[PDB]
Amino acid sequence: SVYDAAAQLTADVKKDLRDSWKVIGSDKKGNGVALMTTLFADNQETIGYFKRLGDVSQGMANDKLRGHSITLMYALQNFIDQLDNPDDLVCVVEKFAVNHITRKISAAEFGKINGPIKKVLASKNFGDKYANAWAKLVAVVQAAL
Amino acid sequence: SVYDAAAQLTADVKKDLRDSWKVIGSDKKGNGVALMTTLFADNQETIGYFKRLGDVSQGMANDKLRGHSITLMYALQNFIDQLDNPDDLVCVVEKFAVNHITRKISAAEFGKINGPIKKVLASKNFGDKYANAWAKLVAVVQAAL
Numbered sequence: 395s396v397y398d399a400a401a402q403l404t405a406d407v408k409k410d411l412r413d414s415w416k417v418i419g420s421d422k423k424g425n426g427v428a429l430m431t432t433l434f435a436d437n438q439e440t441i442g443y444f445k446r447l448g449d450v451s452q453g454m455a456n457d458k459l460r461g462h463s464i465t466l467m468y469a470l471q472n473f474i475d476q477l478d479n480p481d482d483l484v485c486v487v488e489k490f491a492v493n494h495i496t497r498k499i500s501a502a503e504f505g506k507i508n509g510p511i512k513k514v515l516a517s518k519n520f521g522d523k524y525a526n527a528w529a530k531l532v533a534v535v536q537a538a539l
Numbered sequence: 540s541v542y543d544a545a546a547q548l549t550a551d552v553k554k555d556l557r558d559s560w561k562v563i564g565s566d567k568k569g570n571g572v573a574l575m576t577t578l579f580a581d582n583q584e585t586i587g588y589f590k591r592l593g594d595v596s597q598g599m600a601n602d603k604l605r606g607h608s609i610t611l612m613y614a615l616q617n618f619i620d621q622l623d624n625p626d627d628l629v630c631v632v633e634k635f636a637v638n639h640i641t642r643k644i645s646a647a648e649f650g651k652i653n654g655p656i657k658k659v660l661a662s663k664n665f666g667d668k669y670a671n672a673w674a675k676l677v678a679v680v681q682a683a684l
């Protein structure tokens with residue numbers, strides 16, 4: 395249940411999401427591309443899904459990848475801004491869930507993003523505490539897939 | 540090219556865009572739904588393109604329409620944040636252009652959004668000068684369609 399998952403975002407979890415987002419969300423192009431390049435490097439088996447982006451190994455030099463990466467960061471910004479209202483968080487999560495269901499992405503494969511998130515968070519000095527908070531938000535999307 | 544359309548956005552135009560977005564972008568849910576409902580009211584021929592959203596006459600109560608509307612406002616947020624770097628603006632514009640090209644939305648049809656934008660701006664007392672500024676931004680997307 396996406397609603398039961400959203401209910402897991404307690405006061406402490408929301409605070410950790412906001413505090414860390416203030417830092418990682420300040421450089422959407424840089425951190426967005428880092429997130430994607432890490433996903434492709436650590437989980438090569440997912441590259442096939444991103445055929446439209448061309449050669450993803452080019453990273454920042456790939457215009458399609460950069461555009462995709464920046465936009466992905468705005469999806470996260472959207473989620474963060476909706477934390478106050480669970481009904482609005484759910485309707486935006488379901489909107490993005492559809493974007494992935496049409497791409498044949500399962501809850502299990504969507505969860506492969508947790509590794510990259512933990513890694514980039516770690517590079518900014520945000521440990522497991524924060525990685526786990528983000529895993530809870532990702533879990534809301536997983537519940538809708 | 541799209542780059543030409545973007546690179547032409549002047550300091551004054553960017554100023555008007557940012558000043559007006561400070562206001563209309565502050566209530567993404569309210570203004571996002573207002574934009575969509577106005578599009579459907581004045582251009583009923585476009586309703587068919589949004590069948591995935593269900594009964595759009597439901598307005599705010601329609602969770603799919605609400606989720607779509609909020610997300611659309613973040614696409615605009617994305618554009619506004621990239622104004623000072625044409626290279627970044629171009630790659631995000633091309634990304635969203637693909638989302639509409641796949642739906643067979645022509646440059647002319649995409650331009651139908653100018654009417655609704657002008658009305659929403661006017662509701663907050665932003666006149667023709669501002670509507671013209673936004674038409675120039677919409678024109679950047681049209682250059683990609």
Ligand code: HEM
Nearest residue numbers: 440443444446465466469470493497499503504506507638
């Ligand atoms: C924090 C997690 C993630 C977020 C917020 C997210 C967000 C997005 C957004 C905003 C889009 C563009 C939607 C569209 O325009 O159709 C997208 C596209 C896509 N995503 Fe994700 N995504 C995430 C994780 C993943 C993961 C882990 C996979 C794969 C295992 C995945 C696979 C895809 C694919 C295949 C596309 C289509 C790319 C294209 O052809 O343009 N996403 N995602």
Ligand code: HEM
Nearest residue numbers: 493585588589591610611614615638642644648649651652
């Ligand atoms: C300010 C201009 C506009 C912006 C920023 C915008 C933004 C968006 C975004 C972000 C999406 C979701 C893309 C996806 O997830 O696949 C979308 C979908 C769509 N847009 Fe637009 N759009 C604009 C104008 C228009 C206009 C004027 C039309 C029609 C004449 C249009 C038709 C569509 C359609 C048919 C969809 C698919 C809806 C669905 O089935 O989910 N858009 N738009």
Ligand SMILES: ClCCCc1ccccc1
Nearest residue numbers: 414415418425429511514
């Ligand atoms: Cl503070 C939350 C950071 C989420 C994230 C976004 C992009 C890349 C890595 C992590």
